[PDB]
Every structure is written in structure tokens, then in C-alpha cells.
């Protein structure tokens, strides 16, 4: 069902146990890749962001994936909707900290309920996001294109 079950942790803010959920792209080795724990360490521009997306579709060499994170408890809901807050009123994203297995990088994005889904992730190559969806964390997931053992 979910693909990895952990905290998403920005200290001094919020951090709490979440799932996540495929939305776009391979989620394979996910699982066994992430952490336990995910530090989210500063904020950057979306257009930072978009800008290397859109580069990163040209070059064959790495794979976007997308995933939706949701929280297990309801004491995790009232972190979620913190971190989430932080974000969208900054109107930034948010970058992970952790050196992990394959991840080149990874970018947690606010996505309200009503916002429109950003133009570069157009059309999902997986389950996608249903029209009527609460404000979500996104995970952007920046993987090296590979086959493995």
C-alpha cells in the first residue's frame, strides 16, 4: 500500500511520523533507501526548484518521483499542518538534509487544496492526486537513472 513510514524532522518547527504514497513516477527501492528519519534543513525558491526539474527532464540521466505524505496520528496531524504552514505562508519549499543511498536530492513541497498542481509536474505517471485532497506535503523525490542487482 505506502511506501516508507517515518519523520519528517525540521527542528525548532515541527516533526512527526508520516506515510507516503506513490503520485508520480518508479517508487521502486524506496522503501529500503529512505531513512528513518528525514531532516528538512532550510527553504528555497520554487522557481530554484522548477528551473532544475525542467533540466532534469531533458537529460535522460536521472527520474523524477513524486509521493504524498500523510500522518498516522492525529497528534502527527497537528506537526503536519505546522510544517505545511510554515511553507505555503513563506511561499518556499523545502530541501532534505540526509547523505541517502540514491537520492541526489529531495524537495518537500506544500500543495494546497484548492492550488493548482505546478506546471512541471504535468501529467502523472502513476496514481495522481484526486481533485478533492486536504493540503498536502509532496514529496519530490531526485533519483540517478539506473538498473540494479
Not at 525558491?45 to 535522460?60: L, R
Not at 504524498?68 to 505562508?89: G, K, W
Not at 481533485?131 to 509532496?138: E, I, T, V, Y
Amino acid at each position: 500500500n505506502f511506501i516508507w513510514k517515518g519523520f519528517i524532522n525540521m527542528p525548532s518547527v515541527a516533526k512527526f511520523v508520516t506515510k507516503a504514497y506513490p503520485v508520480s513516477g518508479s517508487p521502486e527501492y524506496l522503501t529500503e533507501d529512505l531513512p528513518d528519519s528525514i531532516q528538512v534543513g532550510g527553504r528555497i525558491s520554487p522557481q530554484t526548484v522548477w528551473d532544475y526539474v525542467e533540466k532534469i527532464k531533458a537529460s535522460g540521466t536521472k527520474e523524477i518521483c513524486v509521493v504524498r505524505f500523510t500522518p498516522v496520528t492525529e497528534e502527527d496531524q497537528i506537526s503536519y499542518t505546522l510544517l505545511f504552514a510554515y511553507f505555503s505562508s513563506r511561499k518556499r519549499y523545502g530541501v532534505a538534509a540526509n547523505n541517502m543511498k540514491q537520492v541526489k536530492d529531495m524537495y518537500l513541497i506544500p500543495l494546497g487544496a484548492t492550488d493548482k498542481i505546478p506546471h512541471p509536474l504535468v501529467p502523472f505517471d502513476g496514481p495522481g492526486l484526486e481533485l478533492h485532497r486536504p493540503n498536502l506535503l509532496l514529496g519530490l523525490i531526485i533519483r540517478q537513472k539506473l538498473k540494479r542487482q
